Every structure is written in structure tokens, then in C-alpha cells.
Amino acid sequence: QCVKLNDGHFMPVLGFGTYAPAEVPKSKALEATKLAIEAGFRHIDSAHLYNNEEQVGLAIRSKIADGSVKREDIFYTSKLWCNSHRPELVRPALERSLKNLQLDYVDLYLIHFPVSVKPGEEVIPKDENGKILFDTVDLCATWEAVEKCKDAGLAKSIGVSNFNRRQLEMILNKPGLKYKPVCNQVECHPYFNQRKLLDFCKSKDIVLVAYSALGSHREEPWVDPNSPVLLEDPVLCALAKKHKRTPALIALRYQLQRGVVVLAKSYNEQRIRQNVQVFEFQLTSEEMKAIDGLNRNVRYLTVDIFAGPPNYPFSDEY
Ligand SMILES: NC(=O)c1ccc[n+]([C@@H]2O[C@H](COP(=O)([O-])OP(=O)(O)OC[C@H]3O[C@@H](n4cnc5c(N)ncnc54)[C@H](OP(=O)(O)O)[C@@H]3O)[C@@H](O)[C@H]2O)c1
Ligand SMILES: O=C(O)c1cc(Cl)cc(Cl)c1O
Ligand SMILES: [Zn+2]
Numbered sequence: 001q002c003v004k005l006n007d008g009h010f011m012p013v014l015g016f017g018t019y020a021p022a023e024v025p026k027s028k029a030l031e032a033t034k035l036a037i038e039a040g041f042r043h044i045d046s047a048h049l050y051n052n053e054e055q056v057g058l059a060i061r062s063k064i065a066d067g068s069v070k071r072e073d074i075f076y077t078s079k080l081w082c083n084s085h086r087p088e089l090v091r092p093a094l095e096r097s098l099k100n101l102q103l104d105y106v107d108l109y110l111i112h113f114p115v116s117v118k119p120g121e122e123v124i125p126k127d128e129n130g131k132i133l134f135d136t137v138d139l140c141a142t143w144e145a146v147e148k149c150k151d152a153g154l155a156k157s158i159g160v161s162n163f164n165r166r167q168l169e170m171i172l173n174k175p176g177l178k179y180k181p182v183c184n185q186v187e188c189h190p191y192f193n194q195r196k197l198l199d200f201c202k203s204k205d206i207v208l209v210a211y212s213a214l215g216s217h218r219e220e221p222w223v224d225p226n227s228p229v230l231l232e233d234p235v236l237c238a239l240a241k242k243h244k245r246t247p248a249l250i251a252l253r254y255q256l257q258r259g260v261v262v263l264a265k266s267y268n269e270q271r272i273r274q275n276v277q278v279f280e281f282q283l284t285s286e287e288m289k290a291i292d293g294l295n296r297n298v299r300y301l302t303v304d305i306f307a308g309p310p311n312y313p314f315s316d317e318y
Contacts, residue, residue, distance in 0.1 A: 001279070003261060005182040006205040009157045011108070012043035012075050013256055014278060017211065017265025019050045021219040024267065026055050032267040033059030037068060040276040045211075045263050047079030047112055048097055049123060057101030076103070079112035079161060080146065082306075083119050085137040090145035094154050109146065109155035110185060113162045114139060114313050115306040124305070134309050139167065140174050147178045159183035159207075162303070164313045165200050172204055185209040187216070188260060189230055189251060190291050191298035197318040198260065209261045214248050216300035217265065223300045235294055243281055252278040254291050 002010040016036040018029055029052035033044060037059065046056050060076060063069050078101075084093035094109060116135035118125045125133040149155045159181040160171070171181060184201050188194045188210030201208045215230025216223050230236070236247035243250070248264070248271070255262035256278060264275045283291070299314065306312060 003207060005157055005207060006180050007157050007182055009107070009182070010075075011157075011182070011207065011261060012041075013261050014041065014252070014276065015043035015045045015075075015077070015209070015261065015263040016041035016272075017263045018044060018046045018052055018056050019217065019265060020052075020267060021217055026052060028267050030055035030059050032272065034063060035269055035272045037063045037074075039273045041272075042069070042073055043075045043077075043261075045077045047077075047110075048081045048084075048093060049079065049112060053078065053097050053100040057103060061102060071103075075107045076101075077108035077110065078106045079110040080142075081112055081123055082115060082117045083121075083123055083125065083135075085111075085116040085135065085139070085142045086119060087141045087145035089119055090142060091149055091152070091154070094149050098154065105154055105156060107156045108182070109149055109158055110183070111139070111142060111146065111160045111163070113303060113306065114160075114167055114311045115303075115309050116142075116311070132305060132308075139311070140170065143171055143174065144176075150179055157182045159185065161185040161211075162313050164316045165197065165318055166316055167311075167313060168200065168204065168206065180204070181206055183207040183209050183261070185211055185263075187212045187299060187301050188255065189213050189215055189300075190233065190236065190254060190294040191215070191228065191230055191296050192300075193292065193295045194318070195292075195295075198258070200318070202259065207261050208259070209263065210255050211263045212300050213255055213262050214251055214264060218300070222303075227298060227300055228296075233294060235290060239283075239287060239290070243283075245277070245281060246274065248275065249278055249281075250283075250291070253281065253283055254288065257283055257288055 116137040118133040231247045239250045
């Protein structure tokens with residue numbers, strides 16, 4: 001299926017996640033991405049941060065070349081990293097992703113995370129004592145430069161990631177705004193179901209896109225190892241058994257029935273082909289209510305390296 005974005009464009013409701021932990025070799029992103037396309041995924045999610053935009057581009061372009069899809073059938077997302085928030089650096093960052101990908105445009109370009117870091121080819125820049133080098137950038141200027149990327153045709157749609165209600169408002173209420181964000185891409189799963197923020201995005205015609213929808217990659221030092229493992233949840237497992245599906249497939253269907261566009265990363269061929277079958281079954285309102293009860297305020301990806309600056313998104317209620 002697909003959802004209609006506030007700019008008239010359409011986004012496939014199931015997306016393929018392409019971030020893998022640093023230990024995972026680049027080559028694996030190319031094979032996985034081709035497997036996802038052959039399985040049925042048409043929405044693909046990457047970012048400069050992931051250091052795979054060459055491999056994913058190769059994967060997409062070979063699937064076009066062999067006639068499996070056409071470019072217009074693929075919805076590809078990239079993201080502007082924190083070291084390029086300054087207005088003059090936004091279009092260069094997009095153009096470089098495009099060069100790496102060897103594509104002419106992205107379907108979606110996001111502000112990745114609202115805290116800015118010092119410009120340069122270090123994605124997490126640190127001083128000689130190991131402390132992060134934060135930059136000072138008006139995100140409204142960042143947005144304005146992202147808008148020009150849309151005018152240019154380099155990005156068909158534009159959006160944000162990891163923005164709270166306050167930062168969404170700053171954007172929507174900004175003088176001379178030309179384009180609303182189509183989406184706010186945020187952590188969302190049955191432990192942390194984002195109800196309050198989901199209702200807010202809905203109210204402004206912004207799609208909630210969920211990442212770490214299967215409980216996150218659990219990469220240290222990014223994710224606390226002592227956090228409960230979402231896909232071990234006994235209710236998701238009882239639901240999996242009732243419907244002859246898995247706990248992952250249940251997690252994913254949850255998001256689709258509540259008006260959320262959902263991402264799923266897997267570099268395992270069996271899991272890739274499995275995840276696209278979210279479309280073959282449904283949950284009752286009673287079972288959706290059951291999964292609502294699983295909320296426990298567990299945020300896997302805090303990005304607390306980036307706590308400190310006023311722009312840190314996760315101090316606010318939502
Ligand atoms: N915007 C941001 O700041 C941000 C942050 C985090 C993530 N993202 C995006 O969202 C994507 C997904 O989030 P994520 O990478 O944290 O991973 P995730 O999709 O929540 O999945 C976590 C893990 O689940 C496993 N898995 C996949 N399908 C499964 C299945 N059917 N059964 C059991 N296990 C399964 C995968 O391992 P295998 O590979 O071994 O199958 C994967 O390591 C990322 O790749 C990235 O594209 C964006
Ligand atoms: O996938 C991401 O976008 C992502 C962003 C950040 Cl800031 C950190 C980690 Cl570990 C991620 O996986
Ligand atoms: Zn059922």
C-alpha cells in the first residue's frame with residue numbers, strides 16, 4: 001500500500017531499514033538491499049550517517065537495470081547529518097549522497113537529528129579531550145535550505161527525524177514557510193508507542209514513521225544492553241502463535257493499523273522475506289488494545305552523547 005504525504009506524494013507504508021552496526025561489513029548492505037527489493041520492499045531508508053549509500057544505490061540501480069523495478073517504483077530516503085546543518089552545507093551534503101548513490105534525486109530528505117555538530121568529515125567530531133564539538137545553527141535556516149533542495153528537484157519530499165512537538169511547531173510556525181515536513185521519523189514500538197506525539201503529527205498532517213520498530217539494533221554503546229528485548233515480549237509471542245506469524249510481524253502490523261508508516265531492518269534473507277508479509281493478516285481492535293498495554297516508556301536510542309545542547313529532543317514530555 002501507500003500513504004499520501006502532505007505534498008501530494010506517496011510513501012509505501014512498509015520501509016526497509018539499512019543501518020547496520022559498525023562491525024557489519026559494507027558489502028552486506030548491498031546484498032540485503034537487493035534481497036529486500038526482490039522480496040517486495042519499495043521503500044528504502046538510509047542516511048549519510050550509515051556509510052552505505054554507495055552500496056544501497058548500487059543495489060537499487062541494479063534492480064532497475066535488470067527490470068525488476070523502475071526508479072518511480074522505489075521510494076528512497078536519505079538524511080542530512082548534524083555536521084551539515086549550516087544552510088550553505090545542506091545542498092552540498094545532498095549532492096554528495098546523490099553522487100555516492102549515483103541517482104539524480106532522493107524521494108525523501110530528512111533533517112536527521114536536531115542537535116548540530118562542527119562541520120567537517122568527522123560525523124562525531126571531538127576535541128583533544130574527547131568532548132563533542134557542538135555547532136550553533138538556527139534549524140529554521142537549515143529547514144529553509146532543505147526547502148530549496150525540493151525547489152531544485154534533488155529531493156521530491158522533505159521531512160525531519162527525532163523532532164519533538166516544540167521543534168515541529170517551530171517549523172510549522174516559521175515565517176515564510178514554503179513546505180511542511182511530510183514526516184517525523186522517530187523511535188516507535190510497543191514498549192514506546194509515541195501516542196501523544198503520534199496524535200500531534202496526525203493533527204498537522206505529518207506522517208509518523210517508526211524506526212527501531214522491532215526493538216532496535218541494540219548496538220553498544222548506543223543502546224543500553226540491560227534494556228528489555230522487545231521481540232522476547234510474551235504478549236507479542238502469544239499473538240505470533242495465535243495468528244501463525246512471528247513477534248516481529250506482530251510488532252509491524254501494530255504500526256500499520258494505527259496509521260504509522262513502519263521501518264524494518266534485516267540483513268538476514270529469511271527475515272527480509274518474512275517481514276514483507278505484514279500485509280497478509282490483521283489484528284482485531286481488541287488485540288491492538290492489548291499491544292497498547294505493552295507501553296513501558298523504554299526509549300532504546302537516547303542519542304545521549306548529544307544531551308546537553310538546548311536542541312536535545314528527548315528531555316521534553318514529547
Ligand atoms: N533516523 C534515525 O535516527 C534512525 C535511528 C535508528 C534507526 N533508523 C532506521 O530504521 C532502521 C531500523 O531500525 P534498527 O536498525 O534499529 O533495527 P530494527 O528494524 O528495529 O531491527 C532490529 C533487529 O531485528 C532483527 N530482525 C529483523 N527482522 C526480524 C525478524 N523477523 N525476526 C527476528 N529478528 C528480526 C535484525 O537482525 P537481522 O539483520 O540479523 O535480521 C535487526 O538487527 C535502521 O536500519 C535505519 O534505516 C533511523
Ligand atoms: O540509524 C540511525 O539513524 C541512527 C542514528 C544515530 Cl544518532 C545513532 C544510531 Cl546507532 C543510529 O542507528
Ligand atoms: Zn487476531
